[PDB]
Design a protein around this ligand. Sequence first.
Ligand SMILES: Cc1cc(CCCCCCCOc2ccc(C3=N[C@@H](C)CO3)cc2)on1
Ligand SMILES: Cc1cc(CCCCCCCOc2ccc(C3=N[C@@H](C)CO3)cc2)on1
Lengths: 40, 40, 40, 255, 236, 59, 59, 273, 273, 57
Amino acid sequence: INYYKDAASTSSAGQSLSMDPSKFTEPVKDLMLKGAPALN
Amino acid sequence: INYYKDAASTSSAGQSLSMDPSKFTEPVKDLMLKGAPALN
Amino acid sequence: INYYKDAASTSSAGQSLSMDPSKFTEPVKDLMLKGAPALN
Amino acid sequence: GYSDRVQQITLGNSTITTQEAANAVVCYAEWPEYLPDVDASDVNKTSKPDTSVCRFYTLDSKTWTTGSKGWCWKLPDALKDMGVFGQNMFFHSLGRSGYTVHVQCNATKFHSGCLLVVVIPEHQLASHEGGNVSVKYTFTHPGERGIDLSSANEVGGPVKDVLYNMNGTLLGNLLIFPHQFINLRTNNTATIVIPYINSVPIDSMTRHNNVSLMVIPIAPLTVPTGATPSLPITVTIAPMCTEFSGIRSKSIVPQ
Amino acid sequence: GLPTTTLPGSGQFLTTDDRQSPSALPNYEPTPRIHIPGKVHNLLEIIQVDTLIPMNNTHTKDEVNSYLIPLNANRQNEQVFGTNLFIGDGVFKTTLLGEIVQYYTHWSGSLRFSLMYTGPALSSAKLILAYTPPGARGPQDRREAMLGTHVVWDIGLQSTIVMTIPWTSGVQFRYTDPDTYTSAGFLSCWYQTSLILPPETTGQVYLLSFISACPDFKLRLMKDTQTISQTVALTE
Amino acid sequence: GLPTTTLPGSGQFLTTDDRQSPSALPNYEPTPRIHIPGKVHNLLEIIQVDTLIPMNNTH
Amino acid sequence: GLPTTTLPGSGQFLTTDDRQSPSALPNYEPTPRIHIPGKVHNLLEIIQVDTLIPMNNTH
Amino acid sequence: TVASISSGPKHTQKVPILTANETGATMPVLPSDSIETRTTYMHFNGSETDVECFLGRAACVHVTEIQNKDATGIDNHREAKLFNDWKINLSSLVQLRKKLELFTYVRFDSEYTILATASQPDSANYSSNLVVQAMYVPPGAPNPKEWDDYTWQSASNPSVFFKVGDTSRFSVPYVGLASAYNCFYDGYSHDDAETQYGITVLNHMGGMAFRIVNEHDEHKTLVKIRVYHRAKHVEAWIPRAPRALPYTSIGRTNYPKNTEPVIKKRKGDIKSY
Amino acid sequence: TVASISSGPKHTQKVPILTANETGATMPVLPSDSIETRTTYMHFNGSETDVECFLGRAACVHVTEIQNKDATGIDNHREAKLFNDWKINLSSLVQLRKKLELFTYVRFDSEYTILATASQPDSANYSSNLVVQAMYVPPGAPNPKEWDDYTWQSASNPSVFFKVGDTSRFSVPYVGLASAYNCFYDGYSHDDAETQYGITVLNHMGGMAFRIVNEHDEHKTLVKIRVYHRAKHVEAWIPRAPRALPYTSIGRTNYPKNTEPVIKKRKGDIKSY
Amino acid sequence: TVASISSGPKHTQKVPILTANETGATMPVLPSDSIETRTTYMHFNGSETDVECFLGR
Ligand SMILES: Cc1cc(CCCCCCCOc2ccc(C3=N[C@@H](C)CO3)cc2)on1
Ligand SMILES: Cc1cc(CCCCCCCOc2ccc(C3=N[C@@H](C)CO3)cc2)on1
């Protein structure tokens, strides 16, 4: 129950439960498959 | 009504109403019947 | 609404609205009718 | 014609027969079983030597005499040197096991005496010094020799006072632990099956013992007239459902 | 803004109340439970396991020997042991039963008292155990004893005898702590015929005695035990 | 957090008010009731039984 | 007026609690979000990127 | 409901007003059996005479006192009121006692309110703020010896901490050993020749211990505790004659010797108005 | 539920009262196996003996003390109690300890209540109003050095600020590393020849730090902190024999030398009543 | 959720543990690519590492 009118006044947000490290761990242009050779 | 998000914050648990003394009072391998001889 | 788990914690009881003085006012073994003679 | 009385336990390449048993206890009514995945944490596949480790090792014998106070062995310590069980033990980082314990003591229908055979999960001993003196490692790792409660206090060792279970509790209440009596007049062996009991799924076999087996004379031994005044007590123990994990170099432990 | 009124008791801390609180560690994930044999749910589960009674209390320092009730060969008519039934005191007090009863104020229910015989197998004996319900004195001779709850025990192949002290009471609860009004009786044991040892054998034989509660048992109104105290906080 | 306002009378103790309280003995089980003849429910039940009047008060 | 009782902990400030508060700036409209590459949601996302270890610590 | 029905002249052989009181009954005679009446309604239910209502308001049952002072060199805390204690009981003060003893057996839950106020009878710079801790010490559990014993840990015994000036309130279920509490007991705890007679032996309720949690300031502070008790969920059996003479003791029926006549003597004749 | 069934005379070949205790069982014998009984019902559930109930009330687990005074020229705040600290633990006080050690492994959430009261043992004009700040300093995180270090910023560490005289309350989930807390541990932290034995090595819970936020007034003020702990959501495995001898140390089983006999000696014979 | 799957001996032409870090990627290698593993579950969600939680006290 929100007792207040504005959105800033609500409690903390709830877990992204998004999670996708590939923008950080695999930003390569041509896709690399694990097990296939790195450099062909 | 829980007012809080986490489970630790809820009140005391409610009675097991489990109760089974046999693990402590009769841990024998071959079942003993009351009234039958203890050692055959 | 009870906020508490135990019965002792609830408020006062509510009126018997029982009321039967005959155990105190007429505990006689043979029933006496008003208007009939007391001793026959 | 089956009696509670006669029994055979075959485990691996070794068999035990008793013709004078008094049923058998299975701790907490649970039988040893391997470690389920749902309970697993370490990702390593475990090693299950099976029949080469799950057989019966008979420890060296003790001698019950009228002055005996009782003996105490710790598991898996007592077996730290038995065959391949022991090797596996020093060579893996983690291991887990249940056991069948069979304590033996026979006499004749003229003797009297009664031993308590009890298994205590997590038996943390007390220092006889009091205060917060610790009990050094070696002292709680006697190996197959076990601890002799009628031996003298030593320094860095535990207290050996029997009315207190080596920890500040009374002998009389040890009966809350899985146990069985050996009463010369009834019984000649005691057998207890121990499931693996811990707060972690698998642990180190050298830094932590998870049960102490204790044999304590309670009704003193009384031999017939002009009999030799003593009887030997033998303890045979078999690891069961053993699993080892995290193999490597081979632990080096104090002393 | 909703109008409220606060009642007497606001702000008090009652160690026995049960309410919700904010978690200091929001969102933390506890370690998974694994299976461990032995879970206890009720103290009523454990007081049904029997434990030994130091009945032979007559020593002067605690010894393994006060668990042993001695028996003499060839005595006739005589008395083996006696005790009142104040389960919260005296012999009972250090037993697991005694020890738990002491966490509660009131108890009700039946008790199970058993004796296991340890004499040579070629000996024999007949004992009588008697429960004397509240109202009479501890019996002074078997004749007196045998007129109340009793069991003639014949020592045989079957080593133990289980006597029950059935709940005999006006009031449905008794205090654990020794109350008169609330007192429960006496328990005595006498030779019914007598212990007889085989040839080549000699001396005293002993009985071990246990106590546990029947499934009958009730304990209520928790309190603090006289069995533990301290003078300064402990440290590491 | 829900906004509240406290009214006059907050914190007072009125010996005649009737509200709920926490039980000090959580989970305790009272002794069973048995039957006892004579239960009274109203003082109006008993003032209908007659009793003697010390009319001769002159002593 | 609804009867209440306050519990132990009333008035405390726990830096980790999560509740509602009045907004000091009623009705204010925040700047629109635009798209920015790189959003992080969990610290678990970033500890999977490898970084160099000063293994040769001997200096 | 009619309080009176309409009734007119009577010339009968059926006389409801002649009875025989020797029988033990109180025959239910009404105004309309002996005068001519008109209808009237009751307009009333008898709500406020219900026993729940009669015993259901808080009554002061106990006033004690403890002080906060330096215990240094006190050989007997209990004796210095460094922490008093009260042998729970419900007959120490008499207003409520006469009310309960209108019945023989009574069964109810209790709601306790405890008010604590402080006094500083001799020169203080200020009023300190003390927290009281009242413990329930049922019989069989260690009773406090100093004002800061291990006892006060109260790990298994319900205790409440509140501030002096405030009030504490909690409710205890019916803790009697039998089915009801005996307001009277014509018995002994056993057939002893010298044991005490009465209920003192039956109403074994244990005691309740109060102390201040605060250490001492430079001045001394007197804290006086008042315990109030309210019966809730009341059940009462067997009415008895009300108490006429004054009380002398908790738990005995005894009245004082050379007491005064309790029936008011007429100022005049039997014939006087 | 029946507590006893009706049972009459018996003359059988089936004797339920003869058993063999050597087996390790406690055979479930009842009054009706050896006397003639009548039916009776239980009227009771065993509610208040549930382990959740047994371990579920607040127990005092720790009393510490800090003072508010001018830190000017203090070389060691910790040492002046300018801010004490407590090595969280649950065996320092014994009432609750004996209760927990009835079990080998125990798992529960904790609810802490912290009461703080002030004392002004020497001449003050008044009682000041101090705010306490208790921090959770788990192991691996900077521990406070002065009473006003950067540590107290506590940007990532839960801290509660409450007023002296009041109480603070919050609840912490089960923070154990394993599946349960070990009440006992017959092990070492590694196979070292001199490492400590016990649980001290396992119950690595870190410590909790208290301080007053207020600067100093002209007088000095002693604030004494009492931490209460209530287990909620309890789970207990493997019952053990109760503690008989006194305790000497947090985390070891050790008892004191030349202790006294714990079993009461009879005043009389074995035969005595 | 599985934290580790069961995996046994390998004798392949497909080597997941040889990579080229010069590319800038961190290849998602797991215990089961280089030792024999057993199944285990995560039992965990990563709740308390959410940025809302990290900056939210
Ligand atoms: C903290 C804290 C303190 C307490 C006290 C618990 C209440 C226990 C008292 C139980 C009720 O006591 C009595 C005593 C006497 C009578 C009684 N005597 C007769 C005249 C009639 O009733 C009734 C209840 O609980 N938590
Ligand atoms: C502000 C603030 C302060 C805190 C403290 C957080 C709580 C951390 C303590 C965790 C629980 O600690 C223990 C310690 C020991 C035991 C235990 N030892 C054995 C005898 C049994 O249990 C259990 C829990 O959180 N926020």
